[PDB]
């Protein structure tokens, strides 16, 4: 035998995939168009633990204090208020 499942991608396209009968279908599948779609039944909404990549703000905080940057911002504002 053979099953069939329906998926949709973020761009709105939908796809069909004949998965196996005795296996368990994943919640997300890499569709033909290359986007990572989701199984339309909508079950098992995992958070996916999608942490953001190391950003510039953290890359700066790793070498500065919360007060020093505020003082620098105050200095810049004072500089422009020379107008």
């Amino acid at each position: 035998p053979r099953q069939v499942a329906r998926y949709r991608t973020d761009n709105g396209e939908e796809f069909d995939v004949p998965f196996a009968d005795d296996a368990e279908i994943p919640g997300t599948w890499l569709c033909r168009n290359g986007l990572e779609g989701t199984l339309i039944e909508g079950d098992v909404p995992e958070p996916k633990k999608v942490k953001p990549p190391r950003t510039h703000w953290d890359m700066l905080l790793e070498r500065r204090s919360v007060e020093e940057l505020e003082e620098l911002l105050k200095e810049r504002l004072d500089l422009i208020k020379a107008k």
Binding site: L60, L72, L73, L77
Partner: protein, 302 residues
């Protein structure tokens, strides 16, 4: 100056023949034109630009943070905070545009190692972005002192990642390069391309493993009717057997399914004990081996 010799004539002849039409990797002059349009920075403007970048980043983060709780900023402060937010990326762009000469000069060293000069320049640009992100003026050192490390790291890692048709991890290409580095000195010392044993002795690794690494370092180079009848004969020969006993042979040898069902599984699907399946196998096998059943199947010798 005004001196002409055969070497000068030969050099012109080579250049004339070495390029009849422009190549994709050698036409870097369009990029080099755009670098010259931006002047070099000194220490003072460098530190001011870095401070402006940091102030812009902090202003952006503060503006984003105040959003959840409301706390709407006043018009003057709001506008000035947004101005500094813009000024941060303005300073980032200016500092990045200033220093493309460093990445060009540093990528010039690794050219010809299997990757394009312009690709190396672009990887140097990508590393210089990280360099400007990490550079801190408080240490007192010049930007060129710090950014060279990041540019070199980016270029060498990009070479390690993309320089070969078959990708080889960084921790391997390291030892494949070490192989050539050691081989140069060993050839100089012994005056010959030496044997695996001494190479193992010098490298502190087994001869087999160094040979395997050398193999990994290699570069790719550029450029039935009887079968169907036999299947039918199986059923024809089995026709001489009873269905009850024929089924065991089908399950044991996996006729039309391929799974070699064990004696117990034939028991599970039949509903009996397993040793009985072995007994059926033996009896049916003795029956079938008789010439009266396997008469013509000998033609299928292989």
């Amino acid at each position: 100056d005004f001196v002409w010799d055969e070497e000068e004539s030969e050099a012109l002849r080579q250049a004339r023949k070495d390029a009849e039409l422009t190549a994709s990797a050698d036409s870097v002059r369009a990029y080099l034109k755009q670098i010259g349009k931006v002047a070099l920075l000194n220490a003072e403007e460098e530190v001011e630009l870095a401070k402006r970048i940091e102030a812009g980043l902090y202003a952006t983060q503060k503006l984003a943070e105040l959003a959840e709780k409301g706390e709407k900023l006043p018009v003057q402060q709001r506008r000035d905070m947004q101005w500094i937010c813009r000024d941060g990326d303005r300073a980032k762009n200016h500092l990045l545009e200033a220093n493309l000469r460093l990445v060009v000069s540093l990528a010039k060293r690794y050219t010809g190692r299997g990757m394009a000069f312009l690709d190396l320049i672009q990887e140097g640009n990508l590393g210089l972005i990280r360099a400007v992100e990490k550079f801190d003026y408080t240490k007192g050192y010049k930007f060129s002192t710090y950014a060279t490390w990041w540019i070199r790291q980016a270029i060498t890692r990009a070479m390690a990642d993309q320089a070969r048709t078959i990708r080889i991890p960084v921790h391997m290409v390291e030892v494949i390069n070490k192989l050539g580095r050691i081989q140069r000195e060993l050839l100089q010392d012994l005056g010959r391309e030496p044997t695996p044993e001494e190479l193992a002795k010098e490298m502190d690794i087994t001869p087999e493993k160094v040979l395997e690494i050398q193999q990994y370092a290699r570069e790719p180079i550029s450029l039935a009717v009887s079968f169907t009848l036999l299947q039918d004969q199986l059923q024809s020969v089995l026709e001489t057997l009873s269905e009850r006993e024929a089924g065991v042979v089908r399950l044991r040898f996996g006729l039309t399914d391929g799974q070699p069902r064990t004696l117990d599984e034939i028991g599970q699907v039949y509903g009996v004990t397993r040793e009985r399946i072995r007994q059926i196998e033996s009896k049916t096998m003795s029956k079938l081996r008789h010439p009266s059943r396997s008469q013509v199947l000998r033609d299928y010798l292989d």
